[PDB]
Enzyme design. Structure first.
Site, PDB file in Angstrom:
ATOM      1  N   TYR A 160       0.864  -1.300   0.170  1.00 12.85           N
ATOM      2  CA  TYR A 160      -0.235  -0.098   0.009  1.00 12.85           C
ATOM      3  C   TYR A 160       0.841   1.077  -0.066  1.00 12.85           C
ATOM      4  O   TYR A 160       0.380   2.385  -0.148  1.00 12.85           O
ATOM      5  CB  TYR A 160      -0.898   0.060   1.249  1.00 12.85           C
ATOM      6  CG  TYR A 160      -2.353  -0.246   0.981  1.00 12.85           C
ATOM      7  CD1 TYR A 160      -2.542  -1.864   0.952  1.00 12.85           C
ATOM      8  CD2 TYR A 160      -3.327   0.689   0.845  1.00 12.85           C
ATOM      9  CE1 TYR A 160      -4.090  -2.082   0.391  1.00 12.85           C
ATOM     10  CE2 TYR A 160      -4.541   0.281   0.538  1.00 12.85           C
ATOM     11  CZ  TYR A 160      -5.173  -1.068   0.413  1.00 12.85           C
ATOM     12  OH  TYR A 160      -6.285  -1.471   0.107  1.00 12.85           O
ATOM     13  N   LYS A 230       0.489 -14.215   5.197  1.00 16.33           N
ATOM     14  CA  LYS A 230       0.931 -15.250   4.271  1.00 16.33           C
ATOM     15  C   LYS A 230       2.531 -15.278   4.474  1.00 16.33           C
ATOM     16  O   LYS A 230       3.393 -15.000   3.419  1.00 16.33           O
ATOM     17  CB  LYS A 230       0.366 -14.825   2.985  1.00 16.33           C
ATOM     18  CG  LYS A 230       0.680 -15.717   1.902  1.00 16.33           C
ATOM     19  CD  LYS A 230      -0.146 -16.997   1.799  1.00 16.33           C
ATOM     20  CE  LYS A 230       0.037 -17.973   0.912  1.00 16.33           C
ATOM     21  NZ  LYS A 230      -0.875 -19.243   0.971  1.00 16.33           N
ATOM     22  N   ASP A 283      -4.898 -17.171   3.357  1.00 17.65           N
ATOM     23  CA  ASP A 283      -5.777 -17.733   2.711  1.00 17.65           C
ATOM     24  C   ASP A 283      -6.750 -18.672   3.357  1.00 17.65           C
ATOM     25  O   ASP A 283      -7.937 -18.688   3.210  1.00 17.65           O
ATOM     26  CB  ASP A 283      -5.312 -18.731   1.423  1.00 17.65           C
ATOM     27  CG  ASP A 283      -4.018 -19.548   2.059  1.00 17.65           C
ATOM     28  OD1 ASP A 283      -3.472 -19.513   3.219  1.00 17.65           O
ATOM     29  OD2 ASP A 283      -3.742 -20.511   1.099  1.00 17.65           O
ATOM     30  N   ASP A 307      -7.527  -5.110   4.074  1.00 17.67           N
ATOM     31  CA  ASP A 307      -8.220  -4.746   3.262  1.00 17.67           C
ATOM     32  C   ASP A 307      -9.350  -5.743   2.890  1.00 17.67           C
ATOM     33  O   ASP A 307     -10.671  -5.528   2.876  1.00 17.67           O
ATOM     34  CB  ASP A 307      -7.504  -4.115   2.101  1.00 17.67           C
ATOM     35  CG  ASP A 307      -8.314  -3.343   1.092  1.00 17.67           C
ATOM     36  OD1 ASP A 307      -9.406  -2.605   1.489  1.00 17.67           O
ATOM     37  OD2 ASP A 307      -8.112  -3.719  -0.083  1.00 17.67           O
TER      38      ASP A 307
HETATM   39  N1  LIG Z   1      -0.517 -26.715  -2.824  1.00 20.51           N
HETATM   40  C1  LIG Z   1       0.054 -27.121  -1.346  1.00 20.51           C
HETATM   41  O1  LIG Z   1       0.756 -28.013  -1.474  1.00 20.51           O
HETATM   42  C2  LIG Z   1      -0.562 -26.299  -0.225  1.00 20.51           C
HETATM   43  C3  LIG Z   1      -1.467 -25.525  -0.279  1.00 20.51           C
HETATM   44  C4  LIG Z   1      -1.701 -24.849   0.890  1.00 20.51           C
HETATM   45  C5  LIG Z   1      -0.892 -24.676   1.804  1.00 20.51           C
HETATM   46  N2  LIG Z   1       0.041 -25.672   1.822  1.00 20.51           N
HETATM   47  C6  LIG Z   1       1.069 -25.707   3.061  1.00 20.51           C
HETATM   48  O2  LIG Z   1       0.302 -26.598   4.135  1.00 20.51           O
HETATM   49  C7  LIG Z   1       0.940 -26.142   5.402  1.00 20.51           C
HETATM   50  C8  LIG Z   1      -0.221 -25.811   6.372  1.00 20.51           C
HETATM   51  O3  LIG Z   1      -0.860 -24.738   5.915  1.00 20.51           O
HETATM   52  P1  LIG Z   1      -2.215 -24.474   6.557  1.00 20.51           P
HETATM   53  O4  LIG Z   1      -2.595 -25.051   7.884  1.00 20.51           O
HETATM   54  O5  LIG Z   1      -2.548 -22.745   6.564  1.00 20.51           O
HETATM   55  O6  LIG Z   1      -3.503 -24.810   5.633  1.00 20.51           O
HETATM   56  P2  LIG Z   1      -4.056 -26.337   5.280  1.00 20.51           P
HETATM   57  O7  LIG Z   1      -2.748 -27.344   5.464  1.00 20.51           O
HETATM   58  O8  LIG Z   1      -4.732 -26.137   4.008  1.00 20.51           O
HETATM   59  O9  LIG Z   1      -5.134 -26.518   6.575  1.00 20.51           O
HETATM   60  C9  LIG Z   1      -6.041 -25.282   6.687  1.00 20.51           C
HETATM   61  C10 LIG Z   1      -7.079 -25.880   7.218  1.00 20.51           C
HETATM   62  O10 LIG Z   1      -7.846 -26.247   6.166  1.00 20.51           O
HETATM   63  C11 LIG Z   1      -8.929 -27.437   6.386  1.00 20.51           C
HETATM   64  N3  LIG Z   1      -8.600 -28.412   5.624  1.00 20.51           N
HETATM   65  C12 LIG Z   1      -7.208 -28.508   4.894  1.00 20.51           C
HETATM   66  N4  LIG Z   1      -7.077 -29.599   4.370  1.00 20.51           N
HETATM   67  C13 LIG Z   1      -8.440 -30.478   4.670  1.00 20.51           C
HETATM   68  C14 LIG Z   1      -8.948 -31.628   3.994  1.00 20.51           C
HETATM   69  N5  LIG Z   1      -8.181 -32.532   3.288  1.00 20.51           N
HETATM   70  N6  LIG Z   1     -10.170 -31.985   4.630  1.00 20.51           N
HETATM   71  C15 LIG Z   1     -10.637 -31.065   5.306  1.00 20.51           C
HETATM   72  N7  LIG Z   1     -10.344 -30.108   5.792  1.00 20.51           N
HETATM   73  C16 LIG Z   1      -9.261 -29.521   5.241  1.00 20.51           C
HETATM   74  C17 LIG Z   1      -8.392 -27.685   7.985  1.00 20.51           C
HETATM   75  O11 LIG Z   1      -9.411 -26.723   8.479  1.00 20.51           O
HETATM   76  P3  LIG Z   1      -9.976 -26.918  10.097  1.00 20.51           P
HETATM   77  O12 LIG Z   1      -8.903 -27.663  10.921  1.00 20.51           O
HETATM   78  O13 LIG Z   1     -10.601 -25.657  10.573  1.00 20.51           O
HETATM   79  O14 LIG Z   1     -11.279 -27.920  10.075  1.00 20.51           O
HETATM   80  C18 LIG Z   1      -7.231 -27.201   7.994  1.00 20.51           C
HETATM   81  O15 LIG Z   1      -6.614 -26.908   9.542  1.00 20.51           O
HETATM   82  C19 LIG Z   1       1.915 -24.828   5.102  1.00 20.51           C
HETATM   83  O16 LIG Z   1       3.197 -25.223   5.232  1.00 20.51           O
HETATM   84  C20 LIG Z   1       1.310 -24.394   3.579  1.00 20.51           C
HETATM   85  O17 LIG Z   1       2.574 -23.935   3.112  1.00 20.51           O
HETATM   86  C21 LIG Z   1       0.432 -26.257   0.930  1.00 20.51           C
HETATM   87 CA   LIG Z   2      -4.125 -21.534  -0.913  1.00 18.77          CA
HETATM   88 CA   LIG Z   3     -11.537  -2.264   1.325  1.00 14.77          CA
END
Ligand SMILES: NC(=O)c1ccc[n+]([C@@H]2O[C@H](COP(=O)([O-])OP(=O)(O)OC[C@H]3O[C@@H](n4cnc5c(N)ncnc54)[C@H](OP(=O)(O)O)[C@@H]3O)[C@@H](O)[C@H]2O)c1
Ligand SMILES: [Ca+2]
Ligand SMILES: [Ca+2]
Ligand SMILES: NC(=O)c1ccc[n+]([C@@H]2O[C@H](COP(=O)([O-])OP(=O)(O)OC[C@H]3O[C@@H](n4cnc5c(N)ncnc54)[C@H](OP(=O)(O)O)[C@@H]3O)[C@@H](O)[C@H]2O)c1
Lengths: 416, 416
Positions: A160, A230, A283, A307
């Site tokens: 910003y 992030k 996210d 924002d």
């Molecule tokens: N493309 C990828 O490989 C990718 C994408 C996103 C994040 N990440 C990595 O993952 C790590 C953890 O990030 P994060 O905890 O912010 O994100 P996350 O692993 O996506 O988890 C965030 C929340 O989303 C819900 N969730 C995620 N996967 C799920 C599934 N298969 N089934 C049901 N609910 C699900 C759960 O919510 P609730 O606990 O509230 O029920 C979880 O606590 C980080 O190191 C990040 O860099 C990797």
């Molecule tokens: Ca994402």
């Molecule tokens: Ca705004």
């Protein structure tokens, strides 16, 4: 040239000492009408506040409104190209407490944001946006009542800052050359025809914001402060925000590990409550607010994220027609709705004045005029529960009566 | 050293010519297990896909899965500090079509994202994430069925490039000095103890992404493409994205003004439908998706915004347990759930495998194996409608049966 601002003869200036406001019975409050729908919502806010103040104090107190200028109206008052006159900044600082309608910022060129200019020039480093549910408000979600949060958005840095150069410009090419040749940057995928922006995040900027968030949590006996960031992808800006935020909690508020961390608990020195300090990646946070709204309370985040979060959360409780805010600094405060100028509705007496009205509610509370503030809350709840509402609420409800912006202002007054 | 990858003896390599895939009956498909909950969701995806393929083609077709490595498991196979072996990149490109579980990226330090590394090194510049409602899925919103959108997220530039320096480092100080002294930058509020990131956005990067979005809209007879951006505040990056996107529509797809603009219409050459090209500022967009979901369809946006939008939208239709995706480039495609590694659940057989399963659904469709893909959709809908579901759905519903991750995989198969 000659100022066109008229200082009210009947009013007196709010003063600040020891960080405490001294508000006279007849305070002068500067206001900016705002571009676009500012022409609709501002007059409604003026009459609603005046009514609440009159009803609360029976003529003992009265605000002396002082119109000041910025945006379109300023160019008309002061001349072509006078968008933000110096006196506007001076007067807001001098008078301590002010309120504005929204201001139009052009996309992809044109002037830089006047809203940001005001925040930056006045160093109003806190953007404070409470988001709560008013009973009877229609909502796209099944349980809007579970949303009761307060956004602390860092207001002085991040992407910003407005530091960026246009694709193909000499400056952009200059920066790109510096980055590639002197910094050994190899990850710019297409260095040609490439725009470039800079994202700064500092220890000081972070800590003053988080300090305010934690003090607010303490002052209002809130349950938790969640750092949103992030920081996996932006390690040294957003990730640093998270680290500094936690560090601040430990060094200044005695935060201690919860079951081996990473979250902390900060003991409320007034109530003994243990305030949880935690963090969520940004996210994932946009799902958390919808799927687990009751787990979140005070939110501390950087400029851009805040924002986005402001609009996303507001939508859960009726949208940005009911989303107040304040830009707060050490020396003054400028109250302001979350929403913009919505030009497509401008002048139609159509939009919801709730947001700027509830921003005035915050202003009144800020001034210690809590009785008047309470009447605004009461009138708002009363009007919504009566299902006499503006178009944005009416389209989400069955059997409501559609009111104009001005009429909804009267409805609030009628329900005081 | 010696590769530890075993090429299946019974399989054959998918080939690409004229931009068309030639998929044999026995295609070799590389897969990455993924860190964290990858250990739970990947085996479920393997068995569900195998079942759908067997049921659709009765043994005529069969995928020869080839495990390849990255993340934690790679360090265990190849040795300490081998997080992304070169062969993993080579094999994905060579075999054309691949699928991965999630990979862990550390916050505030540690390795840069392997997910981003894969996208960047393979130039998989499209992140494609369809978000639609499966009947019977519990939701925090009243009308989840109105959400039917497809995200085209730019996957190769933006603040995601990973260009940034740590506060107080020689490099950060070097960049800050350059910006202040040589570029005359005055808007860095606190130049000391200040982290710095770079945000690039290029004409070429923008146009290839938007071109894909528009071609998808045409190919699938969609109603509109909405450019999402924060181009009022970031004029030369996000604002340029918007301008280039519109320009591309005009120059390559014959886009014409709708009633004097600013929106365009692009005539679908196959169906004659007029596809609307429009834009929304990003913060406002996070309300629009909740309050006016039916007005949006195909979304084209930059890397970071698309990241946020993916989770926000997914939440409207049950969360990121039911949110598939694909990283697509000109030479290969890597299918991948929207969600991360959710370490707190890792190894508990608890999370929803729906997302990676529906990413395999996209993979199958990508391979032209539409009958198998249809069986996955059918099984998914069948299992959800039977209210036999994983914890993330079960907590939003009354009277559901709680299934493990593995059991929900079987439920999908049972409903084929
Ligand atoms: N493309 C990828 O490989 C990718 C994408 C996103 C994040 N990440 C990595 O993952 C790590 C953890 O990030 P994060 O905890 O912010 O994100 P996350 O692993 O996506 O988890 C965030 C929340 O989303 C819900 N969730 C995620 N996967 C799920 C599934 N298969 N089934 C049901 N609910 C699900 C759960 O919510 P609730 O606990 O509230 O029920 C979880 O606590 C980080 O190191 C990040 O860099 C990797
Ligand atoms: Ca994402
Ligand atoms: Ca705004
Ligand atoms: N602090 C500020 O002054 C501020 C804040 C935000 C934006 N802006 C500026 O405003 C201009 C327009 O931006 P924008 O169209 O993306 O944002 P916007 O002016 O906030 O309008 C976005 C949408 O939000 C809803 N909305 C906004 N204000 C409302 C009200 N008072 N009552 C009911 N609904 C309301 C309307 O939604 P529907 O049409 O869907 O019903 C509107 O179309 C831009 O130049 C931007 O820079 C200024």
């Amino acid at each position: 040239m000659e100022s066109k601002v008229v200082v009210p003869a009947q009013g007196k200036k709010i003063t600040l000492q020891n960080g405490k406001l001294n508000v006279p019975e007849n305070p002068i409050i500067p206001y900016i009408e705002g571009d676009g729908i500012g022409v609709d919502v501002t007059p409604a806010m003026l009459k609603v506040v005046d009514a609440a103040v009159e009803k609360a104090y029976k003529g003992e107190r009265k605000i002396s409104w002082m119109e000041i200028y910025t945006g379109e109206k300023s160019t008309q008052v002061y001349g072509q190209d006078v968008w933000l006159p110096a006196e506007t900044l001076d007067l807001i600082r001098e008078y301590r407490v002010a309120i504005k309608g929204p201001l139009t910022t052009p996309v992809g060129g044109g002037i830089r944001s006047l809203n940001v200019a005001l925040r930056q020039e006045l160093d109003l480093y806190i953007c404070l946006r409470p988001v709560r549910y008013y009973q009877g408000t229609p909502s796209p979600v099944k349980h809007p009542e579970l949303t009761d949060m307060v956004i602390f958005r860092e207001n002085s840095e991040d992407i910003y800052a407005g530091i960026e150069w246009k694709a193909d410009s000499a400056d952009a090419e200059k920066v790109i050359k510096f980055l590639r040749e002197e910094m050994g940057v190899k990850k710019i995928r297409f260095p040609e025809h490439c725009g470039i922006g800079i994202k700064p995040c500092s220890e000081e900027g972070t800590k003053r914001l988080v300090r305010a968030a934690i003090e607010y949590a303490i002052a209002n006996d809130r349950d938790s402060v969640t750092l949103v960031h992030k920081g996996n992808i932006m390690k040294f800006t957003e990730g640093a925000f998270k680290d500094w935020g936690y560090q601040l909690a430990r060094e200044e508020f005695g935060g201690e590990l919860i079951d081996g961390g990473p979250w902390l608990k900060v003991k409320n020195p007034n109530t003994g409550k243990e305030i949880v300090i935690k963090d969520v990646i940004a996210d994932a946070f946009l799902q958390q607010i919808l799927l687990r709204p009751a787990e979140y309370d005070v939110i501390a985040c950087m400029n851009l994220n805040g924002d986005y979060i402001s609009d996303a959360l507001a939508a859960q409780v009726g949208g940005i027609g009911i989303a107040p805010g304040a830009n707060i600094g050490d020396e003054c405060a400028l109250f302001e709705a979350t929403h913009g100028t919505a030009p497509k509705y401008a002048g139609q007496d159509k939009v919801n004045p709730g947001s700027i009205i509830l921003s005035a509610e915050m202003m009144l509370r800020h001034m210690g005029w809590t009785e008047a503030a309470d009447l605004i809350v009461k009138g708002m709840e009363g009007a919504i529960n009566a299902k006499t509402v503006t178009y944005d609420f009416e389209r989400l409800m069955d059997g409501a009566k559609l009111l104009k912006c001005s009429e909804f202002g009267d409805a609030i007054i009628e329900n005081m």
